[PDB]
Design a protein around this nucleic acid. Sequence first.
DNA 1: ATTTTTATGTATCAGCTGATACATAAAAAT
DNA 2: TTTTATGTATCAGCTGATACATAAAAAT
DNA 3: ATTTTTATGTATCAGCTGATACATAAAAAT
DNA 4: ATTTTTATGTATCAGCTGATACATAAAAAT
Lengths: 213, 215, 213, 216, 84, 84, 85
Amino acid sequence: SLLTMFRELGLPLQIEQFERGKTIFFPGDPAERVYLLVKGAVKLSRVYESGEEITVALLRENSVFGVLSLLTGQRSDRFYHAVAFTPVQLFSVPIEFMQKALIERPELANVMLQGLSSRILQTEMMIETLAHRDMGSRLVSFLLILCRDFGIPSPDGITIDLKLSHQAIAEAIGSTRVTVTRLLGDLRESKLIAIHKKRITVFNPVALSQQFS
Amino acid sequence: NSLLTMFRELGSLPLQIEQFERGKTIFFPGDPAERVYLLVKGAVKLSRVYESGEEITVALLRENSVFGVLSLLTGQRSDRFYHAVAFTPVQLFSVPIEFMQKALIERPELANVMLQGLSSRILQTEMMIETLAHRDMGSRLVSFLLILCRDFGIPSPDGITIDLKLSHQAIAEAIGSTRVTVTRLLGDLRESKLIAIHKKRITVFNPVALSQQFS
Amino acid sequence: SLLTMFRELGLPLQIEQFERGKTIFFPGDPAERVYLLVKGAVKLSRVYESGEEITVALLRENSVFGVLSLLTGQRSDRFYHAVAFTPVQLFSVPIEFMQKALIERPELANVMLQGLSSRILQTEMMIETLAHRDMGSRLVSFLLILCRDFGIPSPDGITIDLKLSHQAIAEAIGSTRVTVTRLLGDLRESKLIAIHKKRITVFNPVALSQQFS
Amino acid sequence: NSLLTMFRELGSGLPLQIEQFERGKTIFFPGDPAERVYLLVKGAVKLSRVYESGEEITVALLRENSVFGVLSLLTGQRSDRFYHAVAFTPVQLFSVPIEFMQKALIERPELANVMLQGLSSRILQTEMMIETLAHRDMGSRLVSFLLILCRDFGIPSPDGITIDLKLSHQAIAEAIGSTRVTVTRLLGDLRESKLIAIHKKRITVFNPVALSQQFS
Amino acid sequence: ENYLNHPTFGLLYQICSFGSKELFATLYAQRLFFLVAFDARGTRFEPIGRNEARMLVDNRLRQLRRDASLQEYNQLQQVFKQTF
Amino acid sequence: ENYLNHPTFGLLYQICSFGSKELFATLYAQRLFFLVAFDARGTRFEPIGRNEARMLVDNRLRQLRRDASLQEYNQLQQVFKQTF
Amino acid sequence: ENYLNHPTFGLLYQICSFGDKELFATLYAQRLFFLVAFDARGTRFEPIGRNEARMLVDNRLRQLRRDASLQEYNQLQQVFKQTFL
DNA sequence: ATTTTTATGTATCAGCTGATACATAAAAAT
DNA sequence: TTTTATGTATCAGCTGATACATAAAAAT
DNA sequence: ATTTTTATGTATCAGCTGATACATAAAAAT
DNA sequence: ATTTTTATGTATCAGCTGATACATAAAAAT
Ligand SMILES: O=C(O)CCC(=O)C(=O)O
Ligand SMILES: O=C(O)CCC(=O)C(=O)O
Ligand SMILES: O=C(O)CCC(=O)C(=O)O
Ligand SMILES: O=C(O)CCC(=O)C(=O)O
């Protein structure tokens, strides 16, 4: 439905192609558009003056972002760094075309509030993860989310179908790349995970989740 | 603005404002998620409870906020998982999913005003992510205090009194810490003369100044 | 000679009049002028963005200031706040007409370097004052300079011929106005000073200086 | 730039020879007739007042290409000094008389320009010190002074700026109007704040700008 | 440092006055800015973005140096360096 | 964050490159600014004031976006923020 | 204790009279001294240093001793004492 | 009104974790 | 090359865990 | 090479001084 | 003339910071 409805806002609307590592929007841009991720992964991050990046969320397919535009319109300027973490396809409909499109289709407004809802919970799910104190517990919680969103079925477990750097992980769970490396190595000695072609693979996810009783 | 106005016209006529007293729970984990809420006056505490008996505050919501957002994804079929308690005296609306199905196709004006409400939620939840993503528990606490001042702060003689009574544990539950550490850090803010607790309420001074530190 | 030489750098050159509290130059103005105070007192101060004022020097008659203009010319912008602390008469010749006037008169070049020298020493004298440890000693040291530059002979002592706010004094000595008064009160009980018409009057200036052996 | 070049050509015949001074050597004492103008070429010059109580107060600590001995310009040989010009460090300098200068100024109008340039710099540097001592917070006052040191004698270092000159806690205390003990006290508090480090009796600041940002 | 409660966005704080529309902004890292109109009609709001709001406070700083006082210049100076 | 010892004014630090002329500034509050060029002799410092120095780093920011990386701009953005 | 305002140096105070030629001096730490020629427009501030200034006050002390009033000898003793002792 | 249950202040030490620095592997540059 | 990512080792100092006295709040 | 004078780190305690707040007098304002 | 804004006197705290004293390291003296 989301994929289907956004096809019809514009004449159709073209699927925009974005390459590996390309930025979608920068802080300073007028928020005049609403986006919808179709294929791949998108990293939303905050950047400080100290040069530090903090991952807000790593979004998956059929997710709505660019949600600032819905509050004041093009009036407000962006503040996060929307980068395609992987090769990505998306739609990019304007706010003024959306004000049109919402009164036009009440079926679409249904479809949209569906996508928005999912976002709240997924972002709130992340709050749970970061609210842990044990960095061990905090990391696994995060790992489970990745496997949920980007994991593909594998011979012995689930391989997180995307290449992830230790710093990228560290930026997401509020830690240094060092500690990420330390704790991952301890799970490799516990043989709960495996790193295949720079890809993190989970062993018996459920058993890992059962540690969250 | 329109959210309070729009929710008024889904009618049991309109729909009655439900009154809830202080500390009263609105929903528990295990309830069928068949409704969406809109807070009108006061504060709503959403928390997760573990088997260990531990509470973790997910978000502390303000006026004109939409919650109970599970109901819009599958409908009545799913059961809740968070603990929605009235943190203060609260007024709210409570419309069903099946009455909403009708209400959405009825008014695409409300569809607009609803997605506006849900947008606000994303940001406020994302705002909290920033706070907890800090390393320095000192920095993490102030960041959290800024949000409370943003959402519940009232103008005061010398600063900003956060217009709600907050327990040290309730703060500790929201920022991933113990009551002890909250107390110690607050005491260090009293020595830095940045806060004051007057009638059990936290009062910051020119918080502006505190926010710069978080360039 | 300073008063006499500045007269002839124009045709003649008109004496600029300024009332009490009037600013002469602000930070951000291009330094293109060289000044000479004729009657009264000039306060040079630094302003912080916190709103705080610091007195650099309180200049007396026949003093040369606006000295930045001599370094690059009009190219540099000022950063101190030149304010007429009292009713004031001044001369204000430009740098490009000065380039002419100095090679014109080698008599004034002597009279000018005399002026600049005096400034260095008076500013260095202030360094001595503030390099004190005892705020009591520091205040009297400053008071002695005031009496030297602005003090008039009086029935029972020397009245410093200008009205000063404790704050002005404080900003100059880098302390709290209270402390200023506090200390003053203590010299009144020791009866070394009297405040008549808001003017500071020292009893036997020599006696106070003897405390700085 | 030109100051070092111009002073070269006011010679005993000839050029003028570069006078050498060892560490701790005094250049002029109180009571000497002020008949000469100096220019420091390399190292540091400490100007101080001495009291009868035995107390020293640092007026300014001068750097390369600085003009001093400015008393001689007012009356000439007629006046006697009152400050204590000691060679803070190994130092090289020129030492032209006032009567040699009277001729040298009418000789070269180019030097006249280059001289008033040097004197201007002095006013500012001395006025800059006024700003520093006009602080109330001794913590603020010390950092302000340290910033100057760096500015004048700081060399680039691995992690910050090492002031390329040795410092005595008392020497610092004499300059910022304090006792040796406090100086040590405040410096230790900056070591806990890890804004400074002392390696081999040499002080070293980090993120200098960052220190300056604290004085908005 | 003057405060105002926006119905949707919560607490706001004043940046500068103009003539009298005052500029206000959000409290957590000032991502949004608001132009207010205290008409008898009541509180009229008007949202603006970073790019516009930056140059607008910038204009007021230039206005106070040219034809205005200093105390207010000095304090707005701190406000500007705080926000941008 | 590159340093250079000016004969008269002592230590200086680099603001930005251009092409390769660099902007430098004084250490105590960046009270002034210097345009430097590495001739075999260098010996070529050109002083400039706040107003000119402001718009000059400002042009470099825009230029970066128009035609340069993010961080070179990310980094000089830090610098402009600290001095201005 | 007579005062005179020097254009460049500001306030001065009289040390000893002389036959004209009143020695004057600077007020802060008395760091300089001046020979003032009080002639009709004959005003002159001829600068002198401590070494010459010291022996010059000293000379007038002896001068009042042989053939000069006690009262004025007594007073000049004060000035010498304050400036030099 | 008596109780009691829950929240708070205070004081210690053990260990994970951030900061710093280095060797080595992997991957992007080039 | 050349950049970037990763493993390994070692620290200092927060901060979580544990335990107790006392005040405040809810229960009764 | 021997001595010895000067510089530094650490520990304590008594009191001036900055911060805060209030009443009252003096000066500007109108 | 009134008012009211600005300057001054008083009272009380907490915490820097100067004074005092000692052991040890570094530098100059020898
Ligand atoms: O909406 C924006 O402009 C930034 C935030 C965002 O894209 C989002 O969270 O969806
Ligand atoms: O929607 C849920 O079930 C949990 C989260 C929530 O209640 C909300 O944010 O509205
Ligand atoms: O000369 C300047 O511009 C600043 C210092 C000053 O005002 C002066 O002494 O002349
Ligand atoms: O001018 C003098 O003779 C003493 C002080 C000094 O040389 C100076 O600061 O220039």
